[PDB]
Amino acid sequence: ESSIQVKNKGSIKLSNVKSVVNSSGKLVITSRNTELKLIDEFGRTKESYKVPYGAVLAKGDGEQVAGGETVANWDPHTMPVITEVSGFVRFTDMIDGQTITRQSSLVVLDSAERRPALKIVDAQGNDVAQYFLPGKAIVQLEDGVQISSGDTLARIPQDITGGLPRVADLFEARRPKEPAILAEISGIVSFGKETKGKRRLVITPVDGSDPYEEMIPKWRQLNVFEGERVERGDVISDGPEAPHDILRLRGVHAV
Numbered sequence: 001e002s003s004i005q006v007k008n009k010g011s012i013k014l015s016n017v018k019s020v021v022n023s024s025g026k027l028v029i030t031s032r033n034t035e036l037k038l039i040d041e042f043g044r045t046k047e048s049y050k051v052p053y054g055a056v057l058a059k060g061d062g063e064q065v066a067g068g069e070t071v072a073n074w075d076p077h078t079m080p081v082i083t084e085v086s087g088f089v090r091f092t093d094m095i096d097g098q099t100i101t102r103q104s105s106l107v108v109l110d111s112a113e114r115r116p117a118l119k120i121v122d123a124q125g126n127d128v129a130q131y132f133l134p135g136k137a138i139v140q141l142e143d144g145v146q147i148s149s150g151d152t153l154a155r156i157p158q159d160i161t162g163g164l165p166r167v168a169d170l171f172e173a174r175r176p177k178e179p180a181i182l183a184e185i186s187g188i189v190s191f192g193k194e195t196k197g198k199r200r201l202v203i204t205p206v207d208g209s210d211p212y213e214e215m216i217p218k219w220r221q222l223n224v225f226e227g228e229r230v231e232r233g234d235v236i237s238d239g240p241e242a243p244h245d246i247l248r249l250r251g252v253h254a255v
Contacts, residue, residue: 178239
């Protein structure tokens, strides 16, 4: 996230990096899938160096550089996230003993104890931009802060053994320890069904066009966003992937 070493001259080659208003004099990223490339003198690339959305650029797009320099530094542990709207943070549904556990800096709300995402107060008395609240959140700035766009307020910061067994597992297509959960039907991040017959966070679909039912275990954690996180297709949400999923979704050539 913070360590990016380059060799020689090149361009940025964002390859569809979502540029959003960053806190610094830069464009923040809201796209999970960011792939870079280096154009020294021809179309040949020198590295890919995929970076998360939390990265904030230090160089412009396509700018030639001498080399040996980072282009965008991101928190190795903290996961900075761009705010949906610019203005005061709208906090509601706060209950003592259920939404406040530790202490100012305090937890927003607990899903099990009770995700307030009403709106964001862009002005003093005008709001828009839903602030989804995952578990174990932290809020350090109260309402009326009137912060600028691009600020992050604790947006949840932070087998493959090479050899013959790996070759066999590849050939027999052994299922991974943590297959990535995919839903190619209206993939916009939502909330609900935290406690049902399935595990935590059972389902997370969106309307889109003809929504489908996708059970989600949410064993370790999630990879949800505010909105327009994913589009028609699927991306690796959590853990390694499985050949069957790629065959049934991405096609044959990708596999």
